[PDB]
């Protein structure tokens, strides 16, 4: 198999285009057939400040970041971003994150964002 | 249209102490999930309903093994809604072999590949 590197993901916070009462969200991280998830946090600018480690042994494909609106009976996708593994930075240094725009006639477009750090060590 | 999904049970290849699994159902940007059940032949017998306005898409089914820090996917299938029949109640279900990963067409799932030895028993019908 491949030699193991640790993928360290810092789920910092998000910024949603909408009202406080409309978002109670969690973040799911999916990579290499596994997933880990934050707690749900209420608001337009939720803060999680949670770090995750994944043991990675191949550099193909990506890290999928999903932001979900929690519900009682079903959860609803807020949006998602995909981050190819190969160009995640190789460093032991925690970063502040980068702002990533989530992928979802006369209405204004809606753009939701997540602040996310990732680095290999 | 009202899609009804009966998540019946599964049969895994492996020792029973290795599994504490749940089923996630995704359709039209929503998701619902069963409870976790232990063993190599877990029974959930849980029925779900989804309001559909895109009959051209599919239902993604994922089986996950619950862990403390991370969860591991046991496998997945994608059922095109065009294959689901009309009925007024749940049938005994069909066995589907779980595949290891989705095929992505332009960032959207369009199928699955690489069969496992694991299977799930599912009923789906429209009402």
Numbering used by the authors:
A (entry chain A): -2 to 101, 112 to 128
B (entry chain C): 2 to 128
Share the article's original sentences:
The Munc13–1/α-RIM interaction is particularly interesting in this regard since its physiological importance has been demonstrated and both Munc13–1 and α-RIMs are involved in priming and plasticity. Our results suggest that a Munc13–1 homodimer–Munc13–1/α-RIM heterodimer switch regulates neurotransmitter release and some forms of presynaptic plasticity, and reveal the structural basis for homo- and heterodimerization. 2A domain can in fact establish two different types of interactions that lead to either homodimerization with itself or heterodimerization with the RIM2α ZF domain. Since the Munc13–1/α-RIM interaction competes with Munc13–1 homodimerization, this model predicts that Munc13–1 may exist in solution as a homodimer that needs to be disrupted in order to bind to α-RIMs at the active zone.
2A-domain homodimer at 1.44 Å resolution, designed a mutation that disrupts homodimerization, and solved the X-ray crystal structure at 1.78 Å resolution of a Munc13–1 fragment bearing this mutation bound to the RIM2α ZF domain. 2A domain of Munc13–1 encompasses approximately residues 3–130. 2A domain is sufficient and primarily responsible for homodimerization. 2A-domain crystals contains four monomers (referred to as monomers A–D). In contrast, homodimerization involves one side of the β-sandwich. This side contains the concave β-sheet, which interacts with the concave β-sheet of the other monomer in an antiparallel fashion. The interaction involves strand–strand hydrogen bonds through the “naked” edges of the β-sheets, leading to the formation of a β-barrel–like structure. The physiological role of Munc13–1 homodimerization is currently unclear, but it is plausible that it may play an inhibitory role by hindering α-RIM binding or it may help to stabilize Munc13–1 in the cytoplasm, before engaging in interactions at the active zone.
